[PDB]
Amino acid sequence: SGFRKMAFPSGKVEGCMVQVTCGTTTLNGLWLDDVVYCPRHVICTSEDMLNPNYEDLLIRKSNHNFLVQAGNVQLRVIGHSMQNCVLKLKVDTANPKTPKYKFVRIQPGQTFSVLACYNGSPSGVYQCAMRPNFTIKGSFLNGSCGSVGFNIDYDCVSFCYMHHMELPTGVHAGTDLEGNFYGPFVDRQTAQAAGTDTTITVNVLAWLYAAVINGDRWFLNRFTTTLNDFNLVAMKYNYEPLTQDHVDILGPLSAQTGIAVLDMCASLKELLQNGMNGRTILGSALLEDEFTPFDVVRQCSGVT
Amino acid sequence: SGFRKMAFPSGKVEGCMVQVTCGTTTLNGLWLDDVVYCPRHVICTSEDMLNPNYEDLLIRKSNHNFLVQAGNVQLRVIGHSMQNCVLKLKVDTANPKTPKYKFVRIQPGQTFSVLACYNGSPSGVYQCAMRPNFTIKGSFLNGSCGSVGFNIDYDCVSFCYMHHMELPTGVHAGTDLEGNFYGPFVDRQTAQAAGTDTTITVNVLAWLYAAVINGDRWFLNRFTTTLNDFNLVAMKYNYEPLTQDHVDILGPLSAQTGIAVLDMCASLKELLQNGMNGRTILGSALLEDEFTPFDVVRQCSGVT
Ligand SMILES: *CC(=O)N1CCN(CCNC(=O)c2cccc3ccccc23)CC1
Ligand SMILES: *CC(=O)N1CCN(CCNC(=O)c2cccc3ccccc23)CC1
């Protein structure tokens, strides 16, 4: 037993990280097969931050201007193209460590692991969630752009995120591996403010089930609620509305614990209204929302 | 910017995980060079849980009774020996993926990453701290024994922990890689209760410095304190006493932020006495103590 914020093992993704330099800018690239994916802003100077015209800036770049280094070995760039906000650098060598992979575009509320990198070198791994306002709360310094987010299904890595920027509020924005930003963000240093960072209700409920499974039960009460009643309280507390789809997704956890989903909603409703009163749930003094129901089942069952 | 509970990249350790089966018991082993390290309780049945005599149980075990599998390939066991609470299974093949490594015995308050494994297969990675009562708060189900804790210094993995057991309170106990338990715990299913789980004061202070660096500054106050005054409050709140050594260790963070260590102690003192008042620091509603000052510097500087 015990329940931790756990990331996927990062080895399969470490084997894909390369350094990409264009002029004075160095960031990370993701090397899969014979293609290196990286943020297109690698071609920008600090001068081009306000209003970059990427097609125009790219005309001045040739294959030999993109320096790609895998470990201490240089890769030969034989083609380059821009797809949305990412560049795809075709190299003459397929990555010998390319895992089975997919490019997926996740929905808000979904979690993933990030392998934070600097100069093509992995520094750490942590678990994130795509927030309902399409930002992520990561840990990214200068040089971390091009670090990726992913999930693993046994031996297949599903890449879902590539880091591009930090908003002036300290939250992060990026793209899927087709180069499309999550949310309304753009790769421009301009006034971009995030919307409401609502709490992912279905994830909090999943985490309350994890708490019960792992012995933390104090918050269980004698009440029940309905989706409509619960949602009036959820709206008041800036929680995402709970749908019948979320109830169905929590079905296996409800079966395992014998606690009906709406009864867990009533426990959550009292926690929202009454607070924790200085108590903790799974070592947390707030309601954790960065575990999906799948993460809870995975961690509670021991999926490898 | 942004500050996350980050684990080290786990690839170097994934390359070392093997499955070890003895009779009906399957757990994990750590394969370094031509030796596989695993908990000696792999030789126990559920029957032997109350009072195992490991020397006696081991007499009935031969090299061919220890089934070691690396991926889908069996390893040949050519010797076995018991060192404290671990078994060392000599195999005929050196692990080709053996990283540069050290075996270190950590002190309470020190953090490390755990690669949770089942049947020799990695399931996830998370960051832990050796608690002042010599337990860890992990995430370990049946089959996770033999999973290891480690730190990485550039390319050298320092293994500090191997998982052996769960106390009836849900907290975890294990050994260093020489097989010596941290704290007073034994590999016996008996009444073993943990002592006071005090808060690692120097780590909370380090995390308050990380908060200031990353923009969360509301808790900064107009006060200062002394080590003695601070420690009267720390004792009252079950915090570890702060020493001049801890003050010296926080020196670089104090220099970076311009906030004297004793001034940060006075901020911590008011947080202890007044609580958070429903506010958060780095997304936490409690004072986080599982980041050492070295972790904060590492994460804030971008060490790879
Ligand atoms: C996150 C990261 O590693 N970055 C790479 C280095 N840049 C500095 C130079 N680039 C910019 O200032 C710049 C220019 C155009 C557009 C953007 C968009 C997002 C971030 C930076 C941008 C900082 C980011
Ligand atoms: C953590 C883990 O994966 N374990 C391996 C499987 N055992 C079940 C069988 N072993 C015991 O019940 C047993 C016997 C003797 C001594 C101990 C000491 C600690 C834990 C189990 C023990 C459970 C643990």
The number of distinct structural domains making up chain B is 3
Contact A286, B280 (CB under 8 A): yes
Domain range for B62 = 15-99
Statement to judge: residues A84 and A120 lie in one domain = no
Number of H helices, E strands in chain A: 8, 13
Q: Kindly report the number of other CB atoms within 10 A of residue B247's CB atom.
A: 18
CA-to-CA distance for A13 and A16, rounded, in angstroms?
5
Burial environment of residue B158 by CB neighbours within 10 A (0 to 12, 13 to 18, 19 or more): middle
CA-to-CA distance for B301 and B296, rounded, in angstroms?
8
Alpha carbon separation from A302 to A134, A299, B3, B140 (Å, rounded): 30, 5, 28, 9
Statement to judge: residues A185 and A244 lie in one domain = no
DSSP-derived pairing of the beta strands A100-103 and A156-166: parallel
Contact A131, A108 (CB under 8 A): yes
Strands, E assignment, chain A: 17-22, 25-32, 35-39, 66-70, 73-75, 77-83, 86-91, 100-103, 111-118, 121-129, 148-153, 156-166, 172-175
CB-closest option in B14, B143, B298 to A302: B143
Statement to judge: residues B10 and B127 lie in one domain = yes
Statement to judge: residues B88 and B147 lie in one domain = no
Q: Which residue is listed with tokens 């959550």?
A: A268
- The best mutation among A41, A175, A188 to test binding of ligand 1, ranked by most ligand atoms within 8 Å of the C-beta, falls on A41
**Which residue, A4, A246, A22, is CA-closest to A125?**
A4
Q: Which residues of B touch A286 (CB under 8 A)?
A: 280, 284-285
Residue B53: HSE in the Cβ half-sphere, 13 Å Cα cutoff? 4
Does residue A226 come out as left (phi exceeding 0), alpha (psi in the -120 to 50 range) or beta?
A: beta
CA-to-CA distance for B21 and B23, rounded, in angstroms?
6
Q: Which residues of A touch B17 (CB under 8 A)?
A: none
Indicate the residue among A76, A99, A122 that finishes a domain: A99
CA-to-CA distance for A39 and A140, rounded, in angstroms?
14
Angle between helices A201-213 and A293-301 (to 10 degrees): 20
Question: Counting ligands in written order, which one lies closest to the CA of residue B22?
Answer: 2
Q: Which residue is listed with tokens 């009036």?
A: A232
Backbone angles phi, psi at B39, to 5 degrees: -60, 140
B259 CB near a chain A CB, below 8 Å? no
Q: Kindly report the number of other CB atoms within 10 A of residue A237's CB atom.
A: 15
Statement to judge: residues B253 and B134 lie in one domain = no
Tokens standing for residue A140:
């990214």
A284 CB near a chain B CB, below 8 Å? yes
CATH code for position A49: 2.40.10.10
Burial B290-301 (b: 16+ CB within 10 A, else e): bbbbebbbbbbe
DSSP-derived pairing of the beta strands B156-166 and B100-103: parallel
Backbone angles phi, psi at A81, to 5 degrees: -150, 155
Statement to judge: residues A253 and A217 lie in one domain = yes
Statement to judge: residues B71 and B137 lie in one domain = no
- Does the CB atom of residue B41 touch ligand 2 within 6 A? yes
**Which residue, A163, A174, A110, A113, is CA-closest to A140?**
A163
Question: Counting ligands in written order, which one lies closest to the CA of residue B26?
Answer: 2
Instruction: Return the residue of A nearest to B280 by Cα.
Output: A286
CATH code for position B256: 1.10.1840.10
Tokens standing for residue A152:
């693993």
Tokens standing for residue A120:
């093509």
Statement to judge: residues A210 and A285 lie in one domain = yes
Statement to judge: residues A132 and A10 lie in one domain = yes
DSSP-assigned letter for residue A64: G
Tokens standing for residue B195:
């002592």
Tokens standing for residue B214:
């990353």
Give, using CA atoms, the residue closest to atom 1 of ligand 1.
A145
Statement to judge: residues A209 and A228 lie in one domain = yes
Give, using CA atoms, the residue closest to atom 8 of ligand 1.
A46
Indicate the residue among B197, B225, B251 that finishes a domain: B197
Neighbouring residues of B180: CB distance < 8 A, sequence distance ≥ 6 = B84, B85, B105
Indicate the residue among B49, B66, B99 that finishes a domain: B99
Contact B39, B87 (CB under 8 A): yes
Contact A63, A92 (CB under 8 A): no
Q: Is B22 a catalytic residue?
A: no
Instruction: Return the residue of A nearest to B298 by Cα.
Output: A123
Contact B157, B102 (CB under 8 A): yes
Q: Which helix (H) or strand (E) holds B159?
A: strand B156-166
The answer to whether the Cα torsion of A8, A12, A15, A21 is positive or negative is negative
CA-to-CA distance for B187 and B193, rounded, in angstroms?
13
- The best mutation among A45, A48, A49, A56 to test binding of ligand 1, ranked by most ligand atoms within 8 Å of the C-beta, falls on A49
CA-to-CA distance for B232 and B217, rounded, in angstroms?
25
User: Which experiment gave this structure?
Assistant: X-ray
Statement to judge: residues A297 and A203 lie in one domain = yes
Tokens standing for residue B67:
């089934």
CA dihedral A181, A184, A190, A194 (to 10 degrees): -110
Statement to judge: residues A86 and A126 lie in one domain = no
CB-closest option in B9, B141, B280 to A10: B9
DSSP-assigned letter for residue B104: -
Q: Which atom of ligand 1 is nearest to the CA of A44?
A: 14
